[PDB]
């Protein structure tokens, strides 16, 4: 469907978050899950799938527990060769009731039939206090791509280039990423909820719907504001 743009006072303010911004930042830092053409090898709960993906640096294999908002999504991708790309975590990563066992949400696309021979550019338009000063491209080889994956590439870029989640040097109070596909749009709040704690597991669960977009159609807008 479509989604109303943020009402005034709806967006999370970093000034009102008194925890570690570091714990938001690590999620969009260099480390992430990206595997190509793999199939689930196990499952813990009915709403998840477990992949075995290689670590090139240490030579071993790690397990990734991918979590979806329901059984239907897990059921869909279960015995399928896929691509997995997402912002993973460890703190409340459960394989039962730890570098080799990471968790994530969504980030899964069928491998076969989703490959372009030539990559597509998707331009991100960064607005700071209403002004499109920065724009940059992210390139994908996927026809249908998770919003998660685009969100990651976008924020990573911003973290490194614009100090996005620098606890001390970030200029930004407010932040949302808006995805536009035809006339329909949705957005995510890029800032942690107020108070003194931040739950990595809970924040990232917004990707467990596995939302996909078309990489030729989607436009990305990021709206930041300064303090």
């Amino acid at each position, epitope marked *: 469907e479509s989604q109303p743009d943020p009402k005034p006072d709806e967006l999370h303010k970093s000034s009102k978050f008194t925890g570690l911004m570091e714990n938001m930042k*690590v999620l969009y830092d260099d480390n992430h899950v990206s595997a190509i053409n793999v199939k689930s090898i196990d499952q813990f709960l009915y709403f998840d799938l477990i992949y075995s993906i290689k670590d090139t640096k240490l030579g071993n294999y790690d397990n990734v527990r991918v979590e979806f908002k329901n059984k239907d999504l897990a059921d869909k991708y279960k015995d399928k060769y896929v691509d997995v790309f997402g912002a993973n975590y460890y*703190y409340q990563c459960y394989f039962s009731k730890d570098k080799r066992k990471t968790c994530m949400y969504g980030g899964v696309t069928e491998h076969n039939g989703n490959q372009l021979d030539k990559y597509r550019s998707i331009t991100v338009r960064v607005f700071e206090d209403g002004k499109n000063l920065l724009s940059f491209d992210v390139q994908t080889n996927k026809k249908k791509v998770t919003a998660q994956e685009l969100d990651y590439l976008t924020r990573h870029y911003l973290v490194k280039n614009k100090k996005l989640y620098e606890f*001390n040097n970030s200029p930004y109070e407010t932040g949302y990423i808006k995805f536009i596909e035809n006339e329909n749009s949705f957005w995510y709040d890029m800032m942690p909820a107020p108070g003194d704690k931040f739950d990595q597991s809970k924040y990232l669960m917004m990707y467990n719907d596995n939302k996909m977009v078309d990489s030729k159609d989607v436009k990305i807008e990021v709206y930041l504001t300064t303090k």
Partner: nanobody
Amino acid sequence: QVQLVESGGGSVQDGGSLRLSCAASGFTIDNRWMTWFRQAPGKEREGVASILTYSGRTVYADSGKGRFTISQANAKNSVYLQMNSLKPEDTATYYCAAGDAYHKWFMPSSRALDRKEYNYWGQGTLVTVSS
């Protein structure tokens, strides 16, 4: 195995200054809290300063406020404690401790000065301050 070796201690007069070093080996300074403690004879170990190496964020106990500064040198795999306006009260053995390296997570600052959190401690360096 993890090792922490402190240096830069010594014997000074009220108002003096020292710089403590801690060389770590067996692990990197990265992505953890590194912390300076001190212990008078017969008192418990107390936290004086900590730095989250991921971000350079710092926590200071009331005792060193306005007087001490903690810092890191990633290239040297070491942390440092600048100690200024020393006073006889600061006479303690000073210890460097390494916080745990959690995967993509850092423990809240409220616990950085708690000794119970730390599994890796150096020998310590003595600081004495004449009145």
